Structure 1
Amino acid sequence: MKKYTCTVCGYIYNPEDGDPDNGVNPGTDFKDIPDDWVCPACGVGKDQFEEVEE
Structure 2
Amino acid sequence: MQKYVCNVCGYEYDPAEHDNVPFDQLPDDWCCPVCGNSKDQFSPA
TM range (shorter): 0.7 to 0.9
Is the aligned partner of 1:48 residue 2:8?
no
TM-score by length of 2: 0.88
State how far apart, in whole Å, the 1-side matches of 2:26 and 2:34 are: 16
Q: After TM superposition, which residue ranges in structure 1, 4 or more long, deviate above 6 angstroms?
A: none
Gaps of 5+ in 2: none
Higher RCO, Cα 8 Å, sep 6+: 2
CA root-mean-square deviation: 0.8
Gaps of 5+ in 1: 19-25
Report the equivalent of 1:13: 13
TM-score by length of 1: 0.75
Larger Rg: 1
- Distance apart, 1:44 and its partner CA: 1.2
Identity of aligned residues (%): 51
What is the identity, as a one-letter code, of the residue corresponding to 2:37?
A: V
The total of aligned residue pairs comes to 45
